[PDB]
Amino acid sequence: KKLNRLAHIRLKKGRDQTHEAKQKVDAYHLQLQNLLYEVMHLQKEI
C-alpha cells in the first residue's frame, strides 16, 4: 500500500511538471507564431 501511494504521488508530480513544461513550450510557440505572422504580413504588404 505504501509503495502504491508513493508511485501514484510520483506519477502525479511528474505529470504536473510535464504540464508546466508543455505550457512553457506553448507560450514560446505562441511568441514564435506571432513573429512568423508579423514576417508573413510584412512580406505580403511588401
Partner: protein, 47 residues
Amino acid sequence: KKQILQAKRIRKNRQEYDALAKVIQHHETLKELEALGKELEHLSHIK
C-alpha cells in the same frame, strides 16, 4: 527590412507610372479622321 526597401522602390515606380498615366489622360483617332474625311468627301459631292 530588405522587402521594405524593395517596397519603397516599387512605390516610387508606381508613382512614376501613375504620373505617366495622368499625363496621358490629361487607333480610334485614325478611324475618326477617316470618318471625317468620308463626311468631307460627301459634303464636297453635295456641294
